[PDB]
Each structure stands twice: as structure tokens, then as C-alpha cells.
Design a binder for this molecule. Structure first.
Ligand SMILES: */C(=C\C(=O)OCC)[C@H](C[C@@H]1CCNC1=O)NC(=O)[C@H](CC(C)C)NC(=O)c1cc2c(OC)cccc2[nH]1
Ligand SMILES: */C(=C\C(=O)OCC)[C@H](C[C@@H]1CCNC1=O)NC(=O)[C@H](CC(C)C)NC(=O)c1cc2c(OC)cccc2[nH]1
Lengths: 294, 300
């Protein structure tokens, strides 16, 4: 079982650069719209606490330089949607895949296509942490890079990059421009809440261990979901929802281990303290990631 | 931040095709008017046990091969064997062929793998060519013909084509000239690799990535000569560090302010004492699959 990115080609064909003045970031070109972080309109004086509405008043369609490589795509309209700009261009991207905009939940994994000046440089797998940050790898010029999943040739875009917190973790928005977490797009040091371990993914990792024959940790006990949640919160683990148990359906059926019986094994591991070669429980592989690469 | 990062795979996705001979199907790479694929596509399940490839190939003609790019059949107009690969000449040229090179990568170097099934890309991840000439990848049934590559300024350097999984779970394959990395052969037999060693240059590059990312606990005032470091490294099954390798670490040494030999002294203590329950970049072991190039690309 390994950490892998989705093939990025469908997303590479949508990356452009958006420039305002001397400030260039990345944009996502789908049909005749380019989506990009709104802070592209900021100068070093506006950045501390920008008044985006007032700043946008002094911007027209002719202020935006949108390029696919060095080829200019003319802007014929512009609007703001939460923390993004939606720039209407005069050319419909012929490389637009079948796509959706999705707002992911904590625990969920996605691929990130890191881009600089509209040019993709790398692709890696990320998980949305319970504190609404991602442990990414981004440098200056990376804003506007997107996160996505691909299911049956449909690209579900879930993330657009905007910020690096003082701790080194990253923060961004969904493709409607709404931040994940309590963060804001301004040049300030913003702290993320205390992070927790992703319970759903640790359980998946345990099932993946059982599928490969590593099952020493299983026991002859069971627990209620409520009693597991009460113990989990004392160990910094996320509580489990009715949905979490339902998504674990496939793995539970495959190994013959009931979800609640697995929680009892995880509950004993938390109270008492290798599995798949590691001393620590992996929490960035979802039940879907285990089922998919089985 | 610091993670395993693959090259964007789009330039390679546009080259992936499916190759079928009877009921045997695997992936091929379509560049200009040629499709490259593992030669074991000509085998039935029984032939794979002990193949005489020249005999199996003379029994096939151009019509024996069915090449599909998505849902469109590409007509085979020529065929030849180049080591463990087949070169199928097709009647059309791939317009999506990027600028490319074929390279035989050296141990310790990394590359991206685009895992494909039935001619369709499924996932992309980074691998390192181990000193024992295997790769620790992730491949399932139907993945043969999947390729490894690097990208440098729009140019794709293809270095690997997938053929086998050893009983230990590691993988074996060839370069794009069809020559296997290591002492492996393309038959249905259980095969062992030589004893592996740790890629010292990569561990040192990764310790520099840890210091760049704020993990410094392993640094100390201990010092070492290049020879005294290599004596310890060899004792622990690590590759010797040459002066050429010390020179490669120059830019990472300048960025962190930690002398190369001082980072060697830190590694020597980590080998001799262990990590004592502590972690480095969220790992309990010393990572050797990041090259100095991989570190600088992500950390500067
Ligand atoms: C993307 C901006 C970009 O590409 O602009 C093109 C000119 C960066 C992404 C960062 C850069 C380093 N790694 C990343 O992930 N975003 C920013 O620089 C933010 C811009 C905001 C939205 C206007 N700012 C920050 O991430 C930011 C600012 C500050 C602080 O200030 C003071 C203090 C601490 C941390 C911090 N982070
Ligand atoms: C790719 C072949 C393919 O796609 O063919 C389509 C019909 C597989 C890749 C393997 C499958 C599981 N993970 C992988 O990486 N290659 C093979 O199966 C090899 C075929 C050879 C080259 C003709 N064979 C092996 O890898 C192989 C055979 C055996 C053994 O036998 C007996 C015993 C132990 C291990 C082993 N590995």
C-alpha cells in the first residue's frame, strides 16, 4: 500500500498564469472562465488588510494579463466570489475535462499540482487535516495551485492554494473561494487550531494491515461508537460519525472484521500503546485509498 | 514543507497505449510511429514459464498485434525485438509525443512512475533505483509496460519500463533499450536480488531538508574526516561518499550553514546511537530516496 498522486494531465491542461502589475500567480481555466486567488490585485501596501471590494473598483478587464504559456487570453469580464476572482475570457479551453467543484471534509485525501508562473512543477498526495490545514510543499509563486481527485475521468477540484501558516502548514479555499478553516487572505501570521489524528484513516490503515496478513492487534472485544468517541477524544483522535462507519463498509466486509470490533482494537492500541512495518499509525490513507489500490 | 513529489505526468499520459497479443494485454509507450512494450506480451500463460522469445516472435506477424490508443485501433505495420522490449511500428504518428530522451539511470537516482492498467493511467509516484538495481514501487496485475521518467524543461527522459515483482515485493524492469536493471530475466520464476545498501548521498540530502524545515535535534559539535565517516558508513551498509558527492552537497551546505563533513558526523552518530524514539521529518528511519536535486527543487 503506497501514497500516490492521480495522473495530473487533465489538470495540467487547465493551468494558466494571471498577472496584475508585477504580481503573478496561477489560475485554473475551465471553459471560458479563469479562477484565481483575489490577492493577485494587491500591492505590498494593500496586503496587510486589503479592502478587496475597494481594490477591485480600480481594476478593469484590461488590467488582467492572463497567459497560457506566453499566449495571452483576453479577459472580457471579472467578478469576485469569496476569496477568488472569476475572470471571463474570450476562449473556451478545449482541454477542459469533465469536472466538479467539491468542498472536501477533514480526513479526505487529494492530489496537489504545484505550479509556478502557470507551469506545473510537481504532483503530490495531501490530506485535509482536522484543523483545516494541509501539510503541503509550496514555495513563493505557488498560489492558485489546485488540489483535486479524479473519479472515472471526472476531476473533482477541492482546493486552491493561498497561504503558508507560521508553523509551515498550508491553508487555502475550495473552488467557490471559501477558506477551509478560520483563515483570511491577508499578510498576517494566523495560527491553526490544535490538530488531531484522523481516526477514520488510522482504522483504514489497520484494515489494509489485516488485508496483507498483519492482524496481531485484533481482539475478541467490541465497543459502542459513543464509548469509542469518548475515549478517542482523550487521545486527541477525531470522533467517528454514522457516515464514517458506512464508508468503512467495504473494508469491514472484505476482512470479516466489524467496524465496531476494529474500533475496540484501536481503542486498546490507544490505551496500551509494529503494524505494516511502522511504530506509528498512518492517518493520511483513506478507506477509499485502501479499497482502490487493493 | 517536505514530501515525495513526482513530476507532472501529462506528457507521459498522452503516450500510453494498450498492446494485445491473443488474450495477453499490457501497456505500451507510443512515441512518433513506434510503440514500445514488454516482449512477454507475445506469451500465453504457459509460454511465460520458460520462453524462447525468438521462437515465439517468429510465430507472430504484424496482424498478431492489436494496439489501441484509448478506443482507436492503431495499425501495426512492422515489428522487431530489442532486448526485452518489442518495437511495433504503427501507421500513424503520435501528435502528443513530447520532446524526449531514453536514459539508463544510475543507482541512487530517482524518477517518477506513471502506473497504468489497460493503457489507462492510474497513479503517479516517486521511486529510487536501489543500489541492488531493484525499485520499491507499487504495481498490480496488468501494470507491465508502465514507465518511469524524469522531466527537464519540457523534455521527458524515459528511464524505466516495468516487467516484474520479486517474491520480496520489490520490482524489476528495463531501460527503454530493453536491458534489465540488475540480474533479472523476463520469465515466470521466483528471483532474488543482491543485498541492498543505503544511498548515503540521499540520506545526507534528506538531513539537510530536515534542517531547512526546522528539525535540528540530530546536529552536534562532533567532527569527522571523509575517510573516518566512510569506515563507519561501510560498517552500517551505507555506500561510501566520494569527494564528487561532497561537492554535490555544496549548495545545501551553503543554504543551511552546516559543513558537509559536519552533517556526516551527525549521520555517524545517528547510525551508532539510533533515533532514540525521536523522528526526523515525521520518519522513524533514515530516508534515502530523495536526491540532492529532489531536495533543492522543493526547498529552494
Ligand atoms: C502564494 C502567493 C503567490 O504565489 O503570490 C504570487 C506573487 C503564497 C504561498 C506561500 C508562499 C510561501 N509558501 C506558501 O505556501 N501566499 C502568501 O504569501 C500569502 C499572501 C496573502 C494571501 C496576501 N501570505 C502568507 O502565506 C503569509 C503571510 C504571513 C505573515 O505575514 C506577516 C506572517 C507569518 C506567516 C505568513 N504567511
Ligand atoms: C506485469 C505483466 C502484465 O501486466 O502482463 C499482462 C498480462 C507483471 C507485473 C507484476 C504483477 C504483480 N505485480 C507486478 O509488478 N509481471 C509479471 O507478472 C512477471 C511476468 C514475466 C516477466 C513473464 N512475472 C513476475 O513478476 C513474477 C513471477 C513470479 C514467480 O513465478 C513462479 C514466483 C514469484 C514471484 C514472481 N514474480
Amino acid at each position: 500500500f503506497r501514497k500516490m498522486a492521480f495522473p495530473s494531465g487533465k489538470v495540467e491542461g487547465c493551468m494558466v498564469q494571471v498577472t496584475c502589475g508585477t504580481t503573478t500567480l496561477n489560475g485554473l481555466w475551465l471553459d471560458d472562465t479563469v479562477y484565481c486567488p483575489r490577492h493577485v490585485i494587491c500591492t505590498a501596501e494593500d496586503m496587510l488588510n486589503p479592502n478587496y471590494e475597494d481594490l477591485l473598483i480600480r481594476k478593469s478587464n484590461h488590467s488582467f494579463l492572463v497567459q497560457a504559456g506566453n499566449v495571452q487570453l483576453r479577459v472580457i469580464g471579472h467578478s469576485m466570489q469569496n476569496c477568488l476572482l472569476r475572470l471571463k475570457v474570450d476562449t473556451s479551453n478545449p482541454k477542459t475535462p469533465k469536472y466538479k467543484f467539491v468542498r472536501i471534509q477533514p480526513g479526505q485525501t487529494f492530489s496537489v499540482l504545484a505550479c509556478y508562473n502557470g507551469s506545473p512543477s510537481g504532483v503530490y498526495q495531501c490530506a485535509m487535516r482536522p484543523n483545516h490545514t494541509i501539510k503541503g510543499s509550496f514555495l513563493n509563486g505557488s498560489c492558485g495551485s489546485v488540489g483535486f481527485n479524479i473519479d472515472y475521468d471526472c476531476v473533482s477540484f477541492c482546493y486552491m492554494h493561498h497561504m503558508e501558516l507560521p508553523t509551515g502548514v498550508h491553508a487555502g479555499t475550495d473552488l467557490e473561494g471559501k477558506f477551509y478553516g478560520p483563515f483570511v487572505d491577508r499578510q498576517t501570521a494566523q495560527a491553526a487550531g490544535t490538530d488531531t489524528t484522523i481516526t477514520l484513516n488510522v482504522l483504514a490503515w489497520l484494515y489494509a494491515a489485516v488485508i496483507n496478513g498483519d492482524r496481531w492487534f485484533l481482539n475478541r472485544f467490541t465497543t459502542t461508537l459513543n464509548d469509542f468517541n469518548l475515549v478517542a477524544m482523550k487521545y486527541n483522535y477525531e470522533p467517528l460519525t454514522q457516515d464514517h462507519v458506512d464508508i468503512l463498509g467495504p473494508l469491514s466486509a472484505q476482512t470479516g472484521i466489524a467496524v465496531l470490533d476494529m474500533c475496540a482494537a484501536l481503542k486498546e492500541l490507544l490505551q496500551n500503546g509494529t503494524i505494516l512495518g511502522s511504530t506509528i499509525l498512518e492517518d493520511e490513507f483513506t478507506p477509499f485509498d485502501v479499497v482502490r489500490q487493493c
